[PDB]
Amino acid sequence: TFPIMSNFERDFVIQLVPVDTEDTMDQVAEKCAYHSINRRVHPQPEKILRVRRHEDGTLFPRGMIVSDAGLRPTETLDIIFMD
Template identity: 50%
Template sequence: MALFPLISNFQYDFVLQLVAVDTENTIDEVAAAAAHHSVGRRVAPRPDKVVRVRRQGGEAFYPRDAKLSDTDIVPMETLEFIFCDA
């Protein structure tokens, strides 16, 4: 377990956020941490959607159940958090 800083580029938010997560967090847990800083503050809640995660400018989403430590994400990388259909 290690602290892991990421940059959150959350859909519909105009602010990039520094988010500290743990290397043992799943991608869904990373998405929840990013949502905590944006949804309900500058981004309207979308309870009918799930938040998916991809690399900034990427097209493929990371698997929701993958552990952060098992991905190719590096510290301080910018990730996009996108609302998608469940």
Template identity: 45%
Template sequence: MAVIPLAAHFHGDFVIKLLPVDSGDTMDQVAAAAAANAVGIHVADQPGRTLRVRKQGAETPYPRTTTVADSGLEPTECVEIYFE
């Protein structure tokens, strides 16, 4: 697999962060990686709520099992991560 750098905006965070992910990672794994850099630091945890990922500006999130490779995301494209 290949490392893909994505720009990640975690809802509630004031910083867009560069997030290196693997092309084989699922959206759940992308969300977890983004959460490690935001939840408890700039964003309050919301236990029991599911993290979701969507392409910046999209209304609907990716299915949780979609891989980065299958999503069609290009390097440095921005994704939004939020609690559902």
């Protein structure tokens, strides 16, 4: 249980998203996608979702867990389509 803001690609507004301090970026993006995908964003199974810090644009590994990325509570994060 840790708060962060979700700035989903192709969306139109950042949202408050609850994630656990153990989720891997892949899981975070999964949770965020719930508040974005199929709501106001066309899915893209062909591609894979990644999560990077918004302040500096640091791309985070797919298997990196919330507990290691440091992150400040409320930290804004970008979820983008990649490979």
